[PDB]
Amino acid sequence: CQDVVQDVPNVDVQMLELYDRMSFKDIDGGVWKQGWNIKYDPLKYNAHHKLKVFVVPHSHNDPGWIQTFEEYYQHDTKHILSNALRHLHDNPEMKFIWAEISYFARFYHDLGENKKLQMKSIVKNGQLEFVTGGWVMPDEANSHWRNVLLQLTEGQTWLKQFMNVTPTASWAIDPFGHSPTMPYILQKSGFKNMLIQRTHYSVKKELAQQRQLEFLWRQIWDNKGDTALFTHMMPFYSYDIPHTCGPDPKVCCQFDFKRMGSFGLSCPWKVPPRTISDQNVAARSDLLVDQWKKKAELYRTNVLLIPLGDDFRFKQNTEWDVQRVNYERLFEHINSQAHFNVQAQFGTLQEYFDAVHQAERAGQAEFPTLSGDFFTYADRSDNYWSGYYTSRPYHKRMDRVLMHYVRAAEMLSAWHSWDGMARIEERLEQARRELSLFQHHDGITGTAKTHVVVDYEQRMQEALKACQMVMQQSVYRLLTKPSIYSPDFSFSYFTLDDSRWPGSGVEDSRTTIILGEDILPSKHVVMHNTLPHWREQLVDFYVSSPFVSVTDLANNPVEAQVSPVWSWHHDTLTKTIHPQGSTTKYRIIFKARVPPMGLATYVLTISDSKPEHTSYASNLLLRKNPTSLPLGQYPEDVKFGDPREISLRVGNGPTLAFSEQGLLKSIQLTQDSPHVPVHFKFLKYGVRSHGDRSGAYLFLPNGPASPVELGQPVVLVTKGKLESSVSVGLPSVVHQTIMRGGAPEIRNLVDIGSLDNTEIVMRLETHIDSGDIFYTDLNGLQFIKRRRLDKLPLQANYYPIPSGMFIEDANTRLTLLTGQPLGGSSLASGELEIMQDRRLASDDERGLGQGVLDNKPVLHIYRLVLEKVNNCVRPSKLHPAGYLTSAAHKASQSLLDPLDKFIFAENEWIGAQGQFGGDHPSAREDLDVSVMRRLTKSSAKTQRVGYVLHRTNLMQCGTPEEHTQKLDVCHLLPNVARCERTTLTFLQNLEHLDGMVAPEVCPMETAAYVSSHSS
């Protein structure tokens, strides 16, 4: 195993280093506005060294943006594909590349057999080529790596089954900035090449000057280079025709033949395209070949890529003709005029890469190595695209909830083979596809029109219902005596109970467990743990009486705590935000201990009085002018007091101090230790009154944030033996700090209401001497070092926080983990900040055509981990990566993959069992079974189950933590007959494993295995 901490990789381009050196000046470079006037030596190419040009027709099809997926399919994409089939069939030398498999599968299943066969033929002969082959072209900032893999696998599994092809070249022309998580996943999925486009204009200039636009992109910690993937970065401002033929858009636009008028398009540079004829082909060729030779100067080989396309192009038959015929006339002339020393033709992306590598092998070029990322993107001036790291945060949080539900549904149902009548495969495919669709770069990014966001939300709700159905049928099968099990596959044996989604204050949708002497004495509940290690975690349920006790299925009492159900209300009468307690429902909390990838059953029983093993939280409402807060049968009266500072400690955990406004002020790790200043504060950013306006994509603040005026907020303190909390009703945010004995949990119920042109940020102020350094994660996969640069504007220093961020000095580290992707930064030493929501009245000129005024209440969740790190073995100062500690990693897992809770629906569960998975191996803490998926339906003689195993890298800080079992996923199901290592999409077998044992992976590695069972 490579050491991912102690060996700084030696690369030619390291993006953090490049950023420290770059000036980022935005000067007018001439016709290539953000470059320079390219010059080339006409004698560079000759009879023995020609420039080979591949013109690659393409059509960017967004799976929802200005219209919904289905609206675009009906209005545009079905015609593009139907006409591509006809035109490619009839013109053998014409080529076309296709990226979005969600649209291709929607089209293909509606085709008659005759056309399916014609389609398969143009794919087999190479005219139509799939690039990447994912369900969508995903966002790379907010997406979790698990969902990037899910959507890639959904598209490629469909392509293997129906087109018999697996792309090895990726095409990502539109995500707003790029992440090294892509080459990581692609290289472990059989890819050999990838292409990107949206990188900062200053980066394109810098790399173009050094001919470093093609590089071997390896991970930041990869010393050896085995993760490297050849990458081509396009050089210009856009992937449209004016910015893909060469440096001068006024010239290139004249070679977009759809812009002469009848299609309602024109050239903004004021010179229109002209139909190629024998009288102008020599002059037109001279102009075009000159653009090509200038673009070729930016690269190292004599093979040039010229994309030919734009958004939803190649629709009309007349458009196919106009582009094809004109380019055919240019090719015939250019290729026959020896003086140009060019051979040009339509080609595919793979053809381009194959020719580049043939040139490389011929010794004509060596490529530089590169590590780092390409955030935060700016396409021009100070227009940095950091706004979409936060836009539509409700759906960003929903993405993470569904991510976990899909994993849990696939894993719970994988243990058995199911009859077709159970509709398990059907519901899982629906769920995987709706979550995969949302990975689109206008889905999770929050950059689609309002009605499109509604469509994605509706699709995800249907996916959550599908997951619940699969999960509850699976739990019933796994925990019911076999000879008693009698399923009705349409019945709800259990309902899921989720405490954090949509969340208290967002939707009152949790069901209360109704117990009563005259109706039902007790109720069974079941917890599932999708992680491969034993886990204890407090769980809570709503119950109709405070006199409830808990037992495990051996009838052993389990200590529990009962607290009131508090809801916050913006009282329009008193103009205050304050809590109301239920007089009919209560919360019961207790620790559930669940096996690795297993289930544990508990029983809640009502009694007429306080149970011996159930305690009751005290409650203290701090506000001047209080009024009573009756709580029905709750046995402890609420206490009142004027606002004041307070201190709380649960268990032997940390002691937290709060201001009189209910916000954290300090954390004391242990009895002796100091009270470390850690101050939460809410501030607001505004919008510029002159110049460019912030919108769904861009963050263009009108200066540093200003504190939210808090007034005298109402603060609620609940103190219990198992769980305590401090909640406060601030303007636009009900802020809650929860303590269960370890790192606190923070929950923000964010309702920006009608505050136009406002972005609400949550900031942490500490003493930590972090300087200008902070760390943020990439797709929940790795932490990258960031350096705040005062030479760049504030918005450029905002980065995606898909799952966590931290600051540290020699001795102390503060890590904030998130349950949803949001934007954030460290704008001053000792600070961390993360945006909560943004409401913007104006459009930001990137095509969306509306502001962001459809905000809705969202419950954001976090864990806050303050730790001493002076004893940790950390990377050297020159290493570009950072790594979490065990506690921060576990805190992240508690947010992303919590225990699932099931409430038995009927009155009695006959044949109920107490546990499942007690014999499953409890793997080392840094290892996860990211995916468990049965790959075969019930009619297959040989069943196959796929596993994706991911091992992260945790810092060594002297905490032994040992004695763990080896996890061999290939023996998790009985009767294993074969075990193979496969690509991450499970589509190619890479290694036949001896003894049918799947070995564990190295830190920072991800491997996939498929076990075969004869059963």
Ligand SMILES: OC[C@@H](NC[C@H]1NC[C@H](O)[C@@H]1O)c1ccccc1
């Ligand atoms: O690349 C330019 C073109 N594309 C904008 C792209 N980015 C956001 C979406 O995913 C879309 O595909 C465009 C079209 C229409 C109006 C303005 C700009």
Ligand SMILES: *[C@@H]1O[C@H](CO)[C@@H](O)[C@H](O)[C@H]1NC(C)=O
């Ligand atoms: C799928 O592609 C492989 C490529 O080697 C080919 O051998 C096989 O016949 C194809 N399967 C069919 C008939 O679709």
Ligand SMILES: [Zn+2]
């Ligand atoms: Zn797009």
